[PDB]
């Protein structure tokens, strides 16, 4: 029963661009750094490139005075492989003592994936750094 966010943070630690496809909040909105009331475009990371060594930042939040959670998708896509998706991901915190979920989807095997920061027991979901690095085949 507390205010409910996520911080997505993408870390390409590989050589090979990655990019960011079909960001959407279902429940809550996205908003700047630092500001969980202060919403922003998906259109400010939407089709957006993460170079090698670049981290970008991704803020949800729930509506904390409806006692709303938040909940999204997005995906990685490979632009040097006409946007094939790299992986599917999904996000749910639920306002309360409600457990949550974080979900790491689909197959590509050019790709490693690694995440960690979670937080699945009741509170807010957090802020989950998601590794990427383009190994091949
Ligand atoms: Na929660």
């Given at each position: 029963?507390?205010?409910?966010?996520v911080?997505?943070?993408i870390?390409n630690?590989?050589?090979?661009?990655?990019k960011?496809?079909?960001?959407?909040?279902?429940?809550?909105?996205?908003?700047?750094?630092?500001?969980?009331?202060?919403?922003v475009?998906?259109?400010?990371?939407?089709?957006?490139?993460?170079?090698?060594?670049?981290?970008?930042?991704?803020?949800?939040?729930?509506?904390?005075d409806?006692?709303?959670?938040?909940?999204?998708?997005?995906?990685?896509?490979?632009?040097?492989?006409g946007d094939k998706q790299?992986?599917?991901?999904?996000?749910?915190?639920?306002?309360?003592?409600k457990?949550?979920?974080?979900?790491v989807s689909?197959?590509?095997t050019?790709?490693?994936i690694?995440?960690?920061?979670?937080?699945?027991?009741?509170g807010?979901?957090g802020?989950?750094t998601?590794?990427?690095?383009?190994?091949?085949?």
């Amino acid at each position: 029963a507390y205010a409910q966010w996520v911080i997505i943070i993408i870390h390409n630690v590989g050589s090979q661009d990655v990019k960011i496809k079909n960001l959407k909040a279902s429940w809550g909105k996205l908003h700047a750094d630092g500001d969980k009331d202060a919403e922003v475009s998906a259109s400010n990371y939407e089709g957006k490139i993460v170079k090698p060594d670049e981290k970008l930042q991704i803020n949800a939040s729930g509506r904390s005075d409806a006692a709303e959670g938040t909940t999204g998708t997005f995906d990685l896509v490979d632009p040097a492989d006409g946007d094939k998706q790299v992986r599917h991901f999904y996000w749910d915190s639920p306002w309360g003592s409600k457990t949550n979920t974080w979900t790491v989807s689909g197959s590509n095997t050019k790709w490693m994936i690694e995440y960690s920061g979670q937080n699945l027991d009741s509170g807010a979901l957090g802020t989950i750094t998601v590794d990427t690095l383009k190994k091949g085949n």
